[PDB]
Amino acid sequence: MTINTEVFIRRNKLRRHFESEFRQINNEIREASKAAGVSSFHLKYSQALLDRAIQREIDETYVFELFHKIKDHVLEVNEFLSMPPRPDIDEDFIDGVEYRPGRLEITDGNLWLGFTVCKPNEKFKDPSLQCRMAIINSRRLPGKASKAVIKTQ
């Protein structure tokens, strides 16, 4: 019960803000991952997660500013791909992994911005993301806190 018309237009303008500024972040990931010397990784996000950033965190372009500053954290998602072969064996497989998680979790300046590899496969170090998790705490904002992680390091 609000004039949800102009707001729908604002959350949609958010989906264009989300996608056009996501072309800015994935364009640094393609060029920087090429310039850092690793693969090139393809970005995909789950639109329900994003429906949370689209309606709870409406016109959260600040999201984009923290991830446009997070950008060099292409290197952390890259150093995550840059490891020796995933199998060394088929039994215990990840012998080059000293027990690490399947996602990257980055925080600072009110933003909890996370990236998860393409999860349904072989998981070839890191050459896709299947979830870019953008969730804040703000003004109007319904605000989440994860126990805390780090910003591009």
Q: Which helix (H) or strand (E) holds 108?
A: strand 103-108
What is the 3 state secondary structure string of 123-152? CCCCCEEEEEEEEECCCCCCCCCCCCCCCC
Query: For the range 115-123, what are the long-range contacts, defined as Cβ-Cβ under 8 Å and sequence gap of 24 or more?
Result: 115/77, 117/80, 118/42, 118/44, 122/86, 123/86
Q: Using what technique was this structure determined? A: NMR
Calpha distance 27→125 (Å, rounded):
20
Farthest CA pair distance, the chain? 59
